[PDB]
Design a protein around this ligand. Structure first.
Ligand SMILES: *[C@@H]1O[C@H](CO[C@@H]2O[C@@H](C)[C@@H](O)[C@@H](O)[C@@H]2O)[C@@H](O[C@@H]2O[C@H](CO)[C@@H](O)[C@H](O)[C@H]2NC(C)=O)[C@H](O)[C@H]1NC(C)=O
Ligand SMILES: *[C@@H]1O[C@H](CO)[C@@H](O[C@@H]2O[C@H](CO)[C@@H](O)[C@H](O)[C@H]2NC(C)=O)[C@H](O)[C@H]1NC(C)=O
Ligand SMILES: *[C@@H]1O[C@H](CO)[C@@H](O[C@@H]2O[C@H](CO)[C@@H](O)[C@H](O)[C@H]2NC(C)=O)[C@H](O)[C@H]1NC(C)=O
Ligand SMILES: *[C@@H]1O[C@H](CO[C@@H]2O[C@@H](C)[C@@H](O)[C@@H](O)[C@@H]2O)[C@@H](O)[C@H](O)[C@H]1NC(C)=O
Ligand SMILES: *[C@@H]1O[C@H](CO)[C@@H](O)[C@H](O)[C@H]1NC(C)=O
Ligand SMILES: O=c1cccccc1O
Ligand SMILES: [Zn+2]
Ligand SMILES: [Zn+2]
Length: 446
C-alpha cells in the first residue's frame, strides 16, 4: 500500500509516487535517490494483456492494472538498490552500496531452541503492536480517497502485522458495484491462479524485512510449520509458541499465550460489501481457532500426509489451462490444494495448503481473515519451501506461467496487488538462495 509521504492530496493529484530520499536543496530534489546513483522517477509498467472472461467489470475496480488507478510514475531503482524511494537494497543485499550479500535460513519452528522460540513469539507480538514506519492503508476506494471535503486523505496508520493482514484482505475483497448492488466475488488477485505462490512469497518476504528493521536484526528469519505430517492435532499449538486451546472456550486460544490477546482486523465484510468502504485499522474480536474441530466436514479434520508433499513435487509444469482452481496436473493448483497430490482435479477434495487452512476451523480458515491467525505465517513459509524446492528441481521454468488469459491479477507481468513498490510475479519466480537472500533448512520425503 502506499508510502505515507505519497498518501497525500498532492501526490494523488500529480499521479506521482516518487518520494525524496533525503534531499540537499529543498523538497523534491532527491526523488528516488537521483542525486546519488540510486534510482529515478519513471513511468510505471503495468500489465496490459487480456485476462480470463470470468471478470466482467473492467473499469470498476482499483485493483485493475495495478497501480495505474492511483499512480502512473514510481521509483525505479538502479542496480541492486531497491525500496519505495530507492533507499534500501534488493533481497539478498545490504550495505550503503548494496554490495554485501546476506543469506538467512528459514528453519522448522520445532527445531528452534527454547530462547529462539520465545524470541520468535515476542517478535510477532511486537509486530502486532508496532506501527508500520512506511506504509499507511486506504479506508476508502479511489473515488472517496481524498475524503468528504476532497482534501483529507482517507488513510490510517497500521501495525506491521496488521499491514500483512490488510494486504491479503485487499487482494481477496469483492469488487464493489454500488450501494444496493451485490458485490462481485468471482475475483481473487492472490488465489486460484498462477500468482498464488509468488504473491504469498512476496507477502512473507515483506513481513520478514519489516520485522528485521523492527528488531534491528538483519538475520532474523521466519520459521516454518511442516503441516504435512498426517496428524490429528496442530503440533505447534502449544503455549510456548502459537498457543494451545483454551480450557474455557474450545474456540479461543489459551490465556497463557500472548496470541489470546490479539484482536483481528477486517472482520466487517457486511460493512465493506454494502457501503463500499475498506478494512481499516480498528481491531475487533479475538482469534478463533479449533484444530480438527470441523465435525461437519470430516475431510478437513486431518492434515496432509507426508507423501502428499512428495507427490505434488513430481508435477513438473508450474500451471496448466485454464490457470484456475480447476486446472489438472498443475503444480500451482496441487500445492495450493484444489487438486489431489497427483494433479487430478476434484471439486470435493481439499489438500495441502487449502487443507491446512481448513484444518484450523476458525479465523485461519476464512479467506478474508486468515492472516489474523499467526499460524498463517508458518503455514505459508512451508508452502513457500515446497515452491522453492520445485523451483530448484525444474530449473525455475516460468514458461507455463501464462502471460495472457489468466484470471485478473494473475497474468505473469501483473504487479502483485497491492504491494509497493510495484513488483511482478516474474520477480518472485526465482530460486530463493541465489536471488532473494534466503533458503530453507528442510528435508524432503523420499
Ligand atoms: C499521469 O497522471 C496524471 C495525474 O492524474 C492522476 O492520475 C491517475 C491516478 C488518475 O486517477 C487521475 O484521475 C489522476 O488525476 C495525469 O494528468 C491528469 O490527466 C487527467 C485526465 O484523465 C486530467 O483530467 C487531469 O487534469 C490531469 N492532471 C494533471 C496534474 O496533469 C496524466 O495524464 C497521467 N499521465 C499518463 C497517464 O501518461
Ligand atoms: C472502520 O471499520 C468499522 C467496521 O466497518 C467501522 O465501524 C462500523 O460502522 C458502521 C457504519 O458507520 C456501523 O453501522 C457499524 O456498527 C460499525 N462497526 C463497528 C464494529 O463499530 C468504522 O466506522 C470504520 N472507521 C472508519 C474511520 O471508517
Ligand atoms: C468450524 O467447524 C464447524 C463444524 O464442526 C462449523 O460449524 C458448522 O457449520 C456448518 C456450515 O454452516 C453447519 O451446517 C453446522 O450446523 C455447523 N455446526 C456447528 C456445530 O456449529 C463452523 O462453521 C466451522 N468454522 C469455520 C470458520 O470453518
Ligand atoms: C500516523 O501516525 C503518525 C506517526 O508517525 C510516526 O510513525 C511511527 C514510525 C511511530 O514511531 C510514530 O510514533 C511516529 O510519530 C502521526 O503523525 C499521524 O497521526 C498518523 N498519520 C496519518 C496519515 O494517519
Ligand atoms: C473451470 O471453471 C471455469 C469457470 O466457471 C469454467 O468455465 C471452465 O469450463 C472450467 N474448466 C473445467 C471444468 O475443466
Ligand atoms: O488460501 C486460503 C484457503 C482456504 C481458506 C481460508 C483462507 C485462505 O487464504
Ligand atoms: Zn492466502
Ligand atoms: Zn493461504
Amino acid at each position: 500500500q502506499f508510502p505515507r509521504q505519497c498518501a497525500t492530496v498532492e501526490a494523488l493529484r500529480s499521479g506521482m509516487c516518487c518520494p525524496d530520499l533525503s534531499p540537499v536543496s529543498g523538497p523534491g530534489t532527491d526523488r528516488c535517490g537521483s542525486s546519488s546513483g540510486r534510482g529515478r522517477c519513471e513511468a510505471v509498467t503495468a500489465d496490459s494483456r487480456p485476462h480470463s472472461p470470468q471478470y466482467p467489470h473492467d473499469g470498476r475496480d482499483d485493483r485493475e492494472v495495478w497501480p495505474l488507478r492511483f499512480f502512473n510514475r514510481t521509483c525505479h531503482c538502479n542496480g541492486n538498490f531497491s525500496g519505495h524511494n530507492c533507499g534500501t537494497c534488493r533481497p539478498g543485499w545490504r550495505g550503503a552500496a548494496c554490495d554485501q550479500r546476506v543469506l538467512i535460513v528459514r528453519r522448522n519452528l520445532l527445531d528452534l531452541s527454547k530462547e529462539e522460540k520465545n524470541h520468535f513469539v515476542r517478535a510477532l507480538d511486537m509486530a502486532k503492536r508496532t506501527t508500520h514506519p512506511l506504509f499507511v492503508i486506504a479506508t476508502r476506494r479511489s473515488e472517496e480517497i481524498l475524503g468528504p471535503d476532497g482534501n483529507t486523505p482517507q488513510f490510517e496508520n497500521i501495525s506491521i502485522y496488521n499491514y500483512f493482514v490488510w494486504t491479503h484482505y485487499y487482494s481477496v475483497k469483492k469488487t464493489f458495484l454500488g450501494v444496493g448492488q451485490e458485490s462481485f466475488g468471482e475475483v481473487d488477485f492472490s488465489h486460484e491462479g498462477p500468482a498464488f505462490l509468488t504473491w504469498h512469497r512476496y507477502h512473507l518476504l515483506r513481513l520478514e524485512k519489516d520485522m528485521q528493521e523492527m528488531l534491528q536484526e538483519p538475520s532474523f528469519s521466519l520459521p516454518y510449520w511442516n503441516f504435512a505430517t498426517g496428524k490429528n492435532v496442530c503440533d505447534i499449538c502449544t503455549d510456548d509458541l502459537m498457543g494451545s486451546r483454551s480450557n474455557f472456550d474450545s474456540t479461543l486460544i489459551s490465556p497463557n499465550s500472548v496470541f489470546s490477546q490479539w484482536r483481528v482486523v477486517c472482520d466487517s465484510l457486511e460493512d465493506y460489501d454494502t457501503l463500499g468502504t475498506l478494512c481499516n485499522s480498528t481491531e475487533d474480536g479475538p482469534i478463533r481457532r479449533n484444530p480438527a474441530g470441523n465435525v461437519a466436514r470430516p475431510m478437513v479434520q486431518r492434515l496432509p500426509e507426508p507423501q502428499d508433499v512428495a507427490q505434488c513435487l513430481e508435477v513438473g509444469l508450474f500451471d496448466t489451462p485454464p490457470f484456475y482452481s480447476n486446472s489438472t496436473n498443475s503444480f500451482r493448483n496441487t500445492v495450493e490444494g484444489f487438486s489431489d497430490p497427483t494433479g487430478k482435479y476434484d471439486p470435493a477434495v481439499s489438500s495441502l495448503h487449502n487443507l491446512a487452512h481448513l484444518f484450523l476451523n476458525g479465523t485461519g480458515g476464512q479467506v478474508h481473515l486468515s492472516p489474523n491467525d499467526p499460524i498463517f505465517v508458518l503455514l505459508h513459509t512451508f508452502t513457500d519451501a515446497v515452491f522453492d524446492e520445485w523451483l530448484r528441481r525444474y530449473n525455475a521454468d516460468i514458461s507455463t506461467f501464462p502471460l495472457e488469459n489468466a484470471p485478473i491479477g494473475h497474468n505473469r507481468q501483473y504487479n502483485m496487488v497491492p504491494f509497493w513498490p510495484p513488483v511482478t510475479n516474474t520477480e518472485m519466480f526465482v530460486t530463493a538462495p541465489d536471488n532473494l537472500g534466503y533458503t530453507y533448512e528442510i528435508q524432503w520425503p523420499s
